[PDB]
Amino acid sequence: FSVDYKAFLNEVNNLNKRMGDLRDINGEAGAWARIMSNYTHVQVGVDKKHELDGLDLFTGFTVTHTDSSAGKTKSVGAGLYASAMFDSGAYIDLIGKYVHHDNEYRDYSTHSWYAGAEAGYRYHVTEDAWIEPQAELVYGSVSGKDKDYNPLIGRTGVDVGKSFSGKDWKVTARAGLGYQFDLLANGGEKDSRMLMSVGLNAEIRDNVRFGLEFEKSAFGKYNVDNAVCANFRYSF
Amino acid sequence: SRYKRQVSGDEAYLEAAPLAELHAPAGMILPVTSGDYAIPVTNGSGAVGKALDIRP
Amino acid sequence: EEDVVKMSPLPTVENQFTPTTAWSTSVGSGIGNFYSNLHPALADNVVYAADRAGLVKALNADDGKEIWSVSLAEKDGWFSKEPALLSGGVTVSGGHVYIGSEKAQVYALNTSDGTVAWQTKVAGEALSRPVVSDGLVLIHTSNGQLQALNEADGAVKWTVNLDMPSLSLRGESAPTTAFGAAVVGGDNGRVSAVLMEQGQMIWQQRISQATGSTEIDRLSDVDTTPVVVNGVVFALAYNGNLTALDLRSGQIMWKRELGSVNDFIVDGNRIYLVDQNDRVMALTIDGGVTLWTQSDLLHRLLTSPVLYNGNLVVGDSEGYLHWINVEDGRFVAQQKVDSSGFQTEPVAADGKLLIQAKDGTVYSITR
Amino acid sequence: AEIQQINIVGNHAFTTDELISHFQLRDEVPWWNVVGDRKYQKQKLAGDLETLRSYYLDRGYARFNIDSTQVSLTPDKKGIYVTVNITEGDQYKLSGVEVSGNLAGHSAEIEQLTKIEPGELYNGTKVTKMEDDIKKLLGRYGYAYPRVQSMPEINDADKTVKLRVNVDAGNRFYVRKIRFEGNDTSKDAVLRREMRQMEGAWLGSDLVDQGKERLNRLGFFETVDTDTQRVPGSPDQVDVVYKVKERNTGSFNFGICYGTESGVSFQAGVQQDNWLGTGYAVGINGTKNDYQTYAELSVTNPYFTVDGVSLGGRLFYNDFQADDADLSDYTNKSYGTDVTLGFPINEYNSLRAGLGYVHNSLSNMQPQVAMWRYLYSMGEHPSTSDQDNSFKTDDFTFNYGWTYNKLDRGYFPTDGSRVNLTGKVTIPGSDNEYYKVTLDTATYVPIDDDHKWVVLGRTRWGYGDGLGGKEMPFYENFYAGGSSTVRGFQSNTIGPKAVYFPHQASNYDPDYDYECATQDGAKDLCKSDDAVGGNAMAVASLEFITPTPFISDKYANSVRTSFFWDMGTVWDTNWDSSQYSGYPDYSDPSNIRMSAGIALQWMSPLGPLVFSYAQPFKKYDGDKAEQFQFNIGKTW
Amino acid sequence: RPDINQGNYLTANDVSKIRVGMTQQQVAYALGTPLMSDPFGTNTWFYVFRQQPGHEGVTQQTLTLTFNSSGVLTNIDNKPALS
Amino acid sequence: PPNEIYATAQQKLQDGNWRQAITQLEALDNRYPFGPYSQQVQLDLIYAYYKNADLPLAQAAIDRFIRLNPTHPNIDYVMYMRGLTNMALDDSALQGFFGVDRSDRDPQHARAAFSDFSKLVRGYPNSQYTTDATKRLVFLKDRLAKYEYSVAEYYTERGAWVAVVNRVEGMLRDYPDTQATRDALPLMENAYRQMQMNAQAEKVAKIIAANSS
């Protein structure tokens, strides 16, 4: 009975990670499709850029699907977003998804929604190093499958990152430290942890990559263990 | 790659084949060479293989 | 217009006199934003006007109505009846209302009986205003030809070939009577003066000194009607070249450079013209010095600077008529008689001011 | 700037709107969400003229000329006016054709072609296909490049036309060398097996280009372009040279994780599609998880013989402790080897046959009829318990198949078809005796020449059964449910339900779901919503493909959207249907399952990503009905 | 099975215009350059017309034209027999 | 200073590797493309690229050297190094290669390497690199003969028997002394036998009888 609660916690993470990857010099454009992954979420969208005076404006649209198998929980959703990088350095990201859930325990199908936003400041300490302080709140409604509740989790934290680049190679190393809290959850997984993330995405030439991640949501209740993954790409 | 220290690329010019002309019965004249493929003679001398210094 | 500067600082003036909105008669169906040379022309205080839909709806000057509704569609049923894309312009003379179309037909209606009509096929589609003088209805064409059509019946004609790049700008330079010479803009920006007599005196003088690839005569063409004042014509290329040519010679030319597409009117000792970046100026007639300048109305398609009741009338693409003063270059009043703009020219004639909208509504405005 | 008017001026008995439809650039959007090239393009405008030219030549006008094309521009620069100034003649009928010039005594095949019946209107493209027909007879004789020039003779006296073709055939050209260059990692046999021009033969310009298209179809080379270069000596000798530029063929992907609760995920695939540079495609892949382990090495060697008879096979391991939802939970330990031979008899008809070995060691099986029939026939013991349903088998099979492929566009076909047939029949040296056949077919028919309206029929059918006294194995069953099959249902939820003999779970964990089981608490027979598949199947679908919902020109051929109706049933031709009060029978064909919906298939950088939303009209025979389906890599 | 087209292409009427008395310069214009010769000793141009359709067997017409060392006469040895 | 990066460029070339001499020589170049030091730094940069396994930049730095300065006193080095850079392209040295070295890939860079070592041997036969270039020419002619040998070997299994005899005829003409020519000799006999005239197979058969392998 926290299998749906975990699916939602993973879905909250994927919500803003998309624009995270962008600022992290590994964001794709046009028909981008990313897989995040016992969980598998498939997110596919399109988004385009504009170089305007005062603010550079990004608009996009995304269709996603979510599945976890242990018993099962799944969902489909369409989302949309606008993201703006100002001249000042302030950047704010506004994102929603309207979500339709199917579960199997018996079946249950319900309708839910969440929207969320983050805003930080692209504070350059160096050209190839950055500090991004950010805050975030995610607000949704989930109809109990279970006491009907409105999630209100948020977080604050600071992400620190460094790129070390060269001729054709580029290692982009980020780490975040965040503090995440639950302000409202009547009816599971209650946000009270501290997510320590560290990751390096390396591209050496073209089509040869050594992506890496290490995520742990400890220091709280219902602590998540070491999610560790590495990904290696090579070509001849 | 996994090349040598003295030269880059796997070297097999030490294990190169001996070259020796063909013979034919009289009545069969082997066709004359076309283009430039003949190995020139050397009158000079020099260190061979990886005993050669290739420093500029 | 520019597509780097859009939405220029909107003019602000308080009304010194409140104008008069009138009959919003929806002539035809409309010209949409589909650019065309069109305008009312009235005679005996009966306005004759039309729109791109092949619908000629006659109007009065004080009260609209009085509609002889003629659907021109002759020589358009090759396979199916199509509406004649009326785009020459309305000009009333001899009781015969000449209106070109983009169907290469120059229609001529009858004021008494719109029913009785004739149409003569012009070489290439009609785009310029049919200015009729010397008993000959002169229409410059988008192909770069000059066709004269007999006032009645349309038998006699003469074919004058003029230069055209075939990759030029648009709008079109109409023939202008100047001592019985048809002074007419090029589509290559070579200003010609053809004597109205079996297509004689075929000579061109190039007014365009524009240089640059795709700018030489592809963005610097005469789209104005040349105005005879004092025996000196003035033709404006899009890219500069306010070339003034004596009618005596024409080869003798002298420059100051200012630009325009929408045909300008020389009234008084002032050259009223809407500039390159839509800046209403009056300039000296023989001088080149700027008498006054209006830069504030900076970017919205301006219409023909006509003179009505001592005011200078231009109209933007939002439907504000602007009255600019002719002595200090500052606005007097500004008013929207229509929600939609104007891309069609206004006509100060009969001591009445008519202007035609994009919806196709022809207002008479009393000032 | 957008097109405002495409005026065609000087028409004679023909409309303007019609011409507008056969242009690249159109002046308006007369429909919904169909916006292609509205961005003005100089190259497309030029192309609009050439099509316009061909169109009037085809109607019978051999005096069609375009005088001049005036591109004016509005002064606001937010409009483009196009006016084409045209002239036309009168209809003309081709009476006869005179072919004059060197035919070389090939006059009884050249002048037997290019012949037009008396009193048939002039067609401009009739001339061009016939010109090419003449060139084809000629290139087979070894006159690779003839000079075929055709201009008409115009007779206005009788309003007719007669045509002159000036067929000037050359001297023969013989290929001296087919040199391959730019083969950085590839051996020569790779580019040389894919030719229909042979060195030291007579040249055919068509035969060289025929070989050029095969080099593009290995997909191991980025760019392939022929060069026909005349050797110093006579122009009767040539060296046909391909400059290829190598792809990034070969990839080592390793993904290794640690997960929650001491979990580990291992995924690796090494694939080299140009292995050892021999152009054989060989790799090895596998995943280890605590959920499921599967590893396969595949050794494919295309074009192994002169004829092109291929050689291929795999060595593989299929190992798991359970089978998730919509299927029955059992321990499999299984491994095998296959070897296939592939026999090309036609460019579009491939036949295959091979030898398949698979060892299955099965244990921990819950009571279920497909299993009950299988272990009954071997004389092993059916048991309430699952440790007493433990067995191992050698299963050795002849495999066969057949393929029709004529897919036109390939990555998003609008025309063309394919027919996939795959089947097996047991050979002695097995402990099992059974037969199957299955096939799947798709046909794409375009209902207009835009290829934006496409009717796609799709169908899949299968039948197998036991052979002799042996039964159908319950792991060689047919299944349905999902994108390819009947969507709107759960994957594999269509077919024979597990009727549950009271299961005595030897290893009963707290609330271990075994459905109707003695250990669970039940003592009666009941069916589930997990389907064990039948030995038979049917699927039929009608998809009608709508134009793109984008007004963006970008996504027009890289995305498709369809409206569909699916129907299907999965049934076992031997069955115990006497086993439940109110059990639907599958022994003879069961009730059809029918689903209808809307789907969007998007070409994505993760392979084709396929979303659909569909409703089964009701739950037929207790089949799980889904509101939304997503699947991954599901091809056209 | 691919179509295997090999050898020089010899028209029946244009191998019936080879006559002793013809020079090797003339034979090379009328049939094209032979693309195949004896590398040993004196030049013997062999105009093999070799076709295997992959559905049918061999059609071989070997026209062996020996021009010796003088290069003035053509010893006609025509064998239109499959191998 | 330019003297100090040159000073530590020698120390990082000699005491160091050839994969760290590049950061100092490009530093000297950042001051002056061509210019004052001309292509002297780019000369040691040829030797730096070659050992760092960056052969396409190495060939390009030879071509810079030979154009901006037409003749050199180390012109013995130049004709040698260009053949060496081409010959390491033939071998499996960079990305993509599959440890093949089976002489059936590219006839371009080996023909180019043979050209460049052949001009070295004829050009300066009093050089120390002459004897070594001579042994590499021998290896490379073996490769070029194995190239037409591989084509002709495939043509016995495409059954194109005219293509066989025009390739072995080409090998008697270009490589009359290679061991790979000798291997291709029975293959020429077989393709001639498939033809109606078996007379020509017998001639080729007699070459095999005469010594050979």
Please state, in angstroms and rounded to a whole number, the distance separating the CA atoms of residues D74 and D39.
16
CB nearest D236 (choices: E2, E13, E32): E32
Structural contact between residues F90 and F110, judged by C-beta atoms closer than 8 angstroms: yes
CB nearest D196 (choices: E2, E28, E35): E2
- 3-state SS of chain C is CCCCCCCCCCCCCCCCCCCECCCCEECCCCCCCCCCCCCCEECCCEEEEECCCCEEEEEECCCCCCCCCEECCCCCCCCCCCCCCECCCCEEECCEEEEEECCCEEEEEECCCCCCCEEEECCCCECCCCEEECCEEEEEECCCEEEEEECCCCCCCCEEECCCCCCCCCCCCCCEECCCEEEECCCCCEEEEEECCCCECCCEEECCCCCCCCCCCCCCCECCCCEEECCEEEEEECCCCEEEEECCCCCCEEEECCCCCCCCEEECCEEEEECCCCCEEEEECCCCCEEEEECCCCCCCCCCCEEECCEEEEECCCCEEEEEECCCCCEEEEEECCCCCCCCCCEEECCEEEEECCCCEEEEEEC
Tell me whether E3 touches chain D (CB under 8 Å).
yes
Residues 6+ apart with CB under 8 A from A176: A157, A158, A159, A160, A195, A196, A197
Instruction: Please list, residue by residue across B10-28, b when 16 or more beta carbons sit within 10 angstroms of its beta carbon and e when fewer do.
Output: bbebeebbebeebebeeeb
DSSP state of B49: G
CA dihedral F74, F80, F85, F90 (to 10 degrees): 180
Is D286 in a helix, a strand, or coil? Answer: strand
User: D494 forms bridges with which residues in the sheet?
Assistant: D480
List the Cα angle A51/A53/A54 in 5-degree steps. Answer: 115
Nearest chain F Cα distance for residue D604, angstroms = 27
Instruction: Please list, residue by residue across E51-78, b when 16 or more beta carbons sit within 10 angstroms of its beta carbon and e when fewer do.
Output: bbeeeeeeebbbbbbebeeeeebbeeee
Query: Tokens 């048991």 belong to which residue?
Result: D383
The reply to whether residue E32 touches residue D200, judged by beta carbons under 8 angstroms, is no
What would the two tokens of residue D374 be? Answer: 């299988």
Tell me whether D5 touches chain C (CB under 8 Å).
yes
CB nearest F104 (choices: D188, D275, D306): D188
Domain locations along chain E: 5-83
Structural contact between residues A109 and A102, judged by C-beta atoms closer than 8 angstroms: yes
Rounded to a whole number, what is the distance in angstroms from the first to the last CA of chain A? 47
Tell me whether F98 touches chain A (CB under 8 Å).
yes
How crowded is the C-beta side of D202, counted as CA atoms within 13 Å? 26
Q: What is the CATH number of domain F1-213?
A: 1.25.40.10
Please state, in angstroms and rounded to a whole number, the distance separating the CA atoms of residues D560 and D609.
11
Query: Tokens 């290739």 belong to which residue?
Result: B54
Structural contact between residues C95 and C110, judged by C-beta atoms closer than 8 angstroms: yes
Residues 6+ apart with CB under 8 A from D111: D99, D103
* Residue of chain F nearest D248, judged by CA positions: F96
Please state, in angstroms and rounded to a whole number, the distance separating the CA atoms of residues E83 and F199.
13
The reply to whether residue D306 touches residue F157, judged by beta carbons under 8 angstroms, is yes
Structural contact between residues A174 and A213, judged by C-beta atoms closer than 8 angstroms: no
Structural contact between residues D154 and D161, judged by C-beta atoms closer than 8 angstroms: yes
In the stretch 101-160 of chain A, residues with CB closer than 8 A to chain D read 102, 104, 107, 109
Please state, in angstroms and rounded to a whole number, the distance separating the CA atoms of residues B33 and C358.
86
Please state, in angstroms and rounded to a whole number, the distance separating the CA atoms of residues D114 and F92.
57
Please state, in angstroms and rounded to a whole number, the distance separating the CA atoms of residues A27 and C281.
52
CA distance readout (Å), D290 to A41, D294, F115: 20, 11, 60
Q: How many domains does chain A have?
A: 1
Domain locations along chain C: 1-367
Closest CA to C1 of C259, C270, C307: C259
Please state, in angstroms and rounded to a whole number, the distance separating the CA atoms of residues D571 and A114.
43
* Residue of chain E nearest D306, judged by CA positions: E1
For residue D376, the surrounding DSSP H or E stretch is: helix D369-378
Residues 6+ apart with CB under 8 A from D281: D271, D272, D273, D274, D275, D298, D300, D302
Please state, in angstroms and rounded to a whole number, the distance separating the CA atoms of residues C182 and D395.
99
Contacts of D198 in chain E (CB under 8 A): 4-6
Q: Amino acid identity, residue F98?
A: F
- CB-based burial of residue F155 (10 Å sphere; 0-12 exposed, 13-18 middle, 19+ buried)? buried
Chains B and D touch (3+ CB pairs under 8 A): no
Q: Would you list the DSSP string of D46-106? A: HHHHHHHHHHHHHHT-SS-EEEEEEEEE-TTSS-EEEEEEEE-----EEEEEEEES--TT-
How remote is the C-alpha of C301 from its chain's centroid?
Answer: 14
Of the residues F196, F202, F203, the best mutation for testing chain E's interface (the one with the most E CB atoms within 10 Å of its CB) is F196
Sign of CA dihedral D515, D516, D517, D518: positive
List the Cα angle D573/D577/D581 in 5-degree steps. Answer: 160
* Residue of chain D nearest C259, judged by CA positions: D75
What would the two tokens of residue D593 be? Answer: 């399952």
* Residue of chain D nearest E3, judged by CA positions: D196
Structural contact between residues C184 and C148, judged by C-beta atoms closer than 8 angstroms: no
What CATH fold (topology level) applies to the domain E5-83? Beta-lactamase Inhibitory Protein; Chain:B, domain 1 (3.30.1450)
Residues 6+ apart with CB under 8 A from D598: D561, D562, D563, D564, D612, D613, D614
Tell me whether B10 touches chain F (CB under 8 Å).
yes
**Pairing of the two strands C181-184 and C176-177:** antiparallel
Task: Provide the residue range defining the domain that includes D272.
Answer: 251-632
- CB-based burial of residue D158 (10 Å sphere; 0-12 exposed, 13-18 middle, 19+ buried)? exposed
Task: Provide the residue range defining the domain that includes A8.
Answer: 1-236
How remote is the C-alpha of D71 from its chain's centroid?
Answer: 43
* Residue of chain F nearest A208, judged by CA positions: F95
Please state, in angstroms and rounded to a whole number, the distance separating the CA atoms of residues D393 and D334.
10
Contacts of D13 in chain C (CB under 8 A): 78-79
Structural contact between residues D415 and D444, judged by C-beta atoms closer than 8 angstroms: yes
Is F29 in a helix, a strand, or coil? Answer: helix
Please state, in angstroms and rounded to a whole number, the distance separating the CA atoms of residues F112 and D591.
73
Closest CA to D88 of D121, D114, D65, D58: D65
Chains touching F by CB (3 or more pairs below 8 Å):
A, B, D, E
Query: Tokens 């099992």 belong to which residue?
Result: D432
Chains touching A by CB (3 or more pairs below 8 Å):
D, F
Please state, in angstroms and rounded to a whole number, the distance separating the CA atoms of residues F49 and C170.
60
Q: Would you list the DSSP string of A12-55? A: HHHHHHHHHHIIIII---SSEEEEE--EEEEEEEEEEEE--SSE
What would the two tokens of residue A6 be? Answer: 């975990």
CA distance readout (Å), C96 to C21, C71, C112, C114, D469: 29, 16, 9, 9, 103
Residues 6+ apart with CB under 8 A from A27: A18, A19, A21
Tell me whether E35 touches chain F (CB under 8 Å).
yes
**Pairing of the two strands A210-218 and A194-203:** antiparallel
Please state, in angstroms and rounded to a whole number, the distance separating the CA atoms of residues D635 and D420.
14
Structural contact between residues C220 and C173, judged by C-beta atoms closer than 8 angstroms: no
- 3-state SS of C100-120 is EECCCEEEEEECCCCCCCEEE
Alpha helices in chain F (DSSP H): 2-14, 22-31, 40-51, 55-68, 75-90, 109-123, 130-155, 161-174, 179-194, 199-209
Please state, in angstroms and rounded to a whole number, the distance separating the CA atoms of residues D221 and D182.
10
Closest CA to D535 of D479, D595, D618: D479
Q: Would you list the DSSP string of B8-35? A: SS---SSSPPPP------TT--PPPP-S
How crowded is the C-beta side of E43, counted as CA atoms within 13 Å? 17
User: A108 forms bridges with which residues in the sheet?
Assistant: A103
Please state, in angstroms and rounded to a whole number, the distance separating the CA atoms of residues C155 and A60.
63
Please state, in angstroms and rounded to a whole number, the distance separating the CA atoms of residues C107 and C99.
5
Sign of CA dihedral B4, B7, B12, B18: negative
- CB-based burial of residue C242 (10 Å sphere; 0-12 exposed, 13-18 middle, 19+ buried)? buried
What would the two tokens of residue D596 be? Answer: 């209808």
Domain locations along chain F: 1-213
Is F58 in a helix, a strand, or coil? Answer: helix
Experimental approach taken: cryo-EM
Ramachandran quadrant class, A85 (left: phi over 0; alpha: psi -120 to 50; beta: rest): beta
CA distance readout (Å), A92 to A50, A58, A156, D621, F39: 16, 11, 14, 52, 52
For residue D214, the surrounding DSSP H or E stretch is: helix D205-215
User: D157 forms bridges with which residues in the sheet?
Assistant: none
Nearest chain F Cα distance for residue E76, angstroms = 14
Tell me whether D231 touches chain F (CB under 8 Å).
no
What would the two tokens of residue C157 be? Answer: 């004609």
Nearest chain F Cα distance for residue A162, angstroms = 22
Please state, in angstroms and rounded to a whole number, the distance separating the CA atoms of residues F27 and F45.
11
Q: Would you list the DSSP string of A52-102? A: -SSEEEEEEEEEEEEEEE--EEEEEEEEEEEEEEESSSEEEEEEEEEEEEE
